[PDB]
Ligand binder design. Structure first.
Ligand SMILES: [Mn+2]
Ligand SMILES: [Mn+2]
Lengths: 137, 137
């Protein structure tokens, strides 16, 4: 039986800017680094950055909607979004759904998000206003 | 401050086969589905499957090393991996370069992994058998 997400691994084209992004800009804890990768944590999340010559710096119009959302409190959301904006981090989408969300790109074009709100909160909102074709289990 | 992964969203090309893969084959909990997506959980993980016409079925030699690992216990690991193999689930990696792991593909070629062990356990193993150039903080 699967018990949760064990780790998220992102392929990166250049290790130093990716470590700077996740550790320094985004505030994650750097636990180890080696010639071809790094391990960081963000709360319970184990993040691995893996240096990969196959990684393309990918414009957001050229990748699909796969994305990785990090939790932040409502109280901290606006100042963190402003930090990303000050650093010139690109936005790939505007929020149109329940709960605050800020949609931003990493140095290689990985699609990231800051989101406020749980699955339970989303399901409660959906029960009141179901999406087209929505069924609950 | 960021506090962990709020959710993982995977773009999928065909919603029903992807829901079946995560729910039926991998045993995740299906909470809701609608015409364009589904919400599942795997322990604390919120997984969203999002129907995306841009998603392509991607062979593993065409994608980078970005991947998503799910936790499984030492007692359950081998029989779950063997069940996926017997069900014909495609693979993408054989060499265990980061401990006890099984590497497999979802229907669209998303790179998945079963892994036994925490970040702390992997750091302890790496102290004895470090990756080239490894430094611990
Ligand atoms: Mn999202
Ligand atoms: Mn892995």
């Amino acid at each position: 039986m699967l018990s949760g997400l064990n780790h998220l691994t992102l392929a990166v084209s250049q290790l130093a800017p990716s470590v700077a992004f996740y550790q320094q800009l985004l505030g994650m804890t750097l636990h180890a680094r080696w010639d071809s990768g790094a391990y960081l944590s963000c709360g319970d999340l184990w993040l691995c950055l893996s240096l990969d010559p196959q990684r393309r710096v990918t414009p957001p119009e050229e990748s699909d909607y796969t994305h990785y959302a990090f939790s932040i409190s409502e109280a901290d959301f606006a100042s963190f979004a402003a930090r990303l904006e000050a650093a010139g981090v690109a936005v790939w989408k505007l929020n149109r759904s329940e709960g605050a969300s800020h949609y931003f790109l990493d140095p290689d074009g990985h699609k990231l998000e800051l989101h406020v709100g749980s699955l339970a909160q989303r399901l409660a909102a959906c029960r009141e206003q179901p999406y087209k074709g929505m069924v609950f289990f």
